């Protein structure tokens, strides 16, 4: 059990911001996308003939269980084709949990809605570099060893405004067992004194992208944890220093009236 604390996992961010315990309709949830996630599940339960209590419970469960975005793979867990087709074939940011009446894993599909999910902004010092090392921190709430981590990044064509995170849009960037280490004084992970930190070589992007983290138990039941992490690089402004030779308003209104429609 656990979640990504850096860059913060999408579901962990929603849980941390709170406001979802009351009113039951999700109206005190401050972030528009977290509120939409909650309301999606809440309205899905009501549409299936559930009571307001059942609907609030299902939507709250999705936020409360931010450390249990899990799926059971069974003994074939090492085979990514088995994972892709039978374990987490859909609703990747929910780790495939789409049954509000059955807990675990409930229905966490609100977290897989498409839209302007707020990303972690990673500033670049150089815009021409194609691999940016990120020290990812994963915050375990239970120590389940032996296990291993896989990290994927969305392909360059992925568009967060349009596309679901799906396996044909993901590329493997990291695959390793990772040691449990003491958290630093600046962590982030308040839930545990120890964390898993790993250097992930993130490919450059000029678009908002998703980092998809998989923590898989090396075990016969094959429980694995899956988290979507929203991120974007901020390109450094100004001219390319290598181009540079050394020395020896009604326009917005206009734009609005003359585009589209």
Ligand X SMILES: *[C@@H]1O[C@H](CO)[C@@H](O[C@@H]2O[C@H](CO)[C@@H](O[C@@H]3O[C@H](CO)[C@@H](O)[C@H](O)[C@@H]3O)[C@H](O)[C@H]2NC(C)=O)[C@H](O)[C@H]1NC(C)=O
Nearest CB to ligand X, comparing residues 175 and 190: 175
CB 125 within 8 A of CB 236: yes
Residue with Cβ nearer ligand X (27 or 175): 175
Long-range (24+ apart) CB contacts under 8 A made by 167-176 are 167/84, 167/89, 167/92, 170/212, 171/203, 173/200, 173/201, 173/202, 173/203, 174/149, 174/150, 174/198, 174/200, 174/201, 175/148, 175/149, 175/150, 175/151, 176/148, 176/149
Count CB-CB contacts under 10 A for residue 141: 13
Does residue 184 belong to the site contacting ligand X (CB under 6 A)? Answer: no
The bridge status of strand 223-234 relative to strand 120-123 is parallel
Identity of the residue, 7 or 224, whose beta carbon is nearer to ligand X in the bound complex = 224
Convert residues 42-81 into a mask of x (bound to ligand X by CB under 6 A) and - (unbound). Answer: ------------------------------------xxx-
User: Is residue 182 close enough to count as binding ligand X by CB under 6 A?
Assistant: no
Q: How many residues bind ligand X (CB under 6 A)?
A: 6
Q: Which is nearer to ligand X, 117 or 212 (CB)?
A: 212
| Contacts to ligand X from residues 154-173, by CB under 6 A | 172
Residue 85 interacting with ligand X (CB under 6 A): no
Pick the binder of ligand X from 27, 28, 53, 175 (CB under 6 A).
Answer: 175
Count of all residues that appear for the chain in the document: 261
The CB-of-232 to ligand X minimum distance in angstroms stands at: 25
Q: Scan for tokens 């032996």, then name that residue.
A: 146
Q: 78 or 184, CB closer to ligand X?
A: 78
Question: Distance between CA atoms of 251 and 28, rounded to whole angstroms?
Answer: 37
> What's the min distance (Å) between Cβ of 78 and ligand X?
4
Per the listing, tokens 């967060």 go with 160
CB of 172 to ligand X, least distance (A): 5
Closest distance to ligand X from the beta carbon of 214 (Å): 8
Alpha carbons 113 and 182: distance in angstroms, whole number: 35
Rank residues 56 and 211 by Cβ distance to ligand X and give the closer one. 211
CB of 82: closest distance to ligand X in angstroms?
8
Q: How far is the CB of 208 from ligand X (least distance, A)?
A: 24
Query: ∠ at Cα 105 (104, 109), nearest 5°?
Result: 155
Give 245's strand partners: none
Binding site for ligand X (CB under 6 A): 78-80, 150, 172, 175
């Amino acid at each position: 059990h656990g979640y990504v604390t850096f860059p913060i996992a999408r579901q962990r961010r929603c849980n941390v911001q709170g406001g979802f315990w009351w009113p039951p309709e999700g109206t005190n949830i401050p972030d528009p996308m977290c509120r939409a996630a909650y309301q999606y599940v809440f309205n899905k339960v009501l549409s299936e003939g559930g009571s307001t209590s059942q609907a609030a419970s299902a939507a709250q469960y999705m936020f409360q269980q931010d450390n249990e975005y899990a799926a059971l793979a069974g003994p074939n867990f090492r085979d990514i084709c088995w994972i892709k087709e039978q374990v987490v074939p859909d609703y990747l940011c929910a780790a495939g949990a789409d049954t509000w009446r059955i807990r675990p894993f409930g229905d966490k599909t609100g977290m897989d809605i498409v839209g302007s999910w707020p990303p972690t902004v990673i500033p670049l010092e150089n815009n021409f570099v194609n691999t940016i090392p990120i020290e990812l921190e994963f915050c375990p709430t239970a120590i389940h060893e032996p296990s291993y981590f896989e990290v994927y990044v969305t392909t360059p064509e992925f568009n967060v405004y349009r596309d679901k995170v799906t396996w044909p849009l993901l590329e493997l960037v990291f695959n390793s067992t990772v040691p449990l280490v003491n958290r630093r004084a600046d962590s982030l992970c308040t839930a545990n004194a120890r964390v898993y930190r790993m250097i992930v070589p993130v490919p450059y992007r000029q678009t908002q992208f998703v980092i998809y983290v998989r923590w898989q138990r090396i075990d016969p039941v094959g429980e694995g944890f899956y988290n979507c992490v929203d991120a974007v690089f901020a390109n450094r402004p100004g001219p390319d220093p290598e181009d540079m030779i050394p020395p020896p308003i009604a326009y917005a209104g206009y734009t609005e009236d003359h585009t589209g429609l």
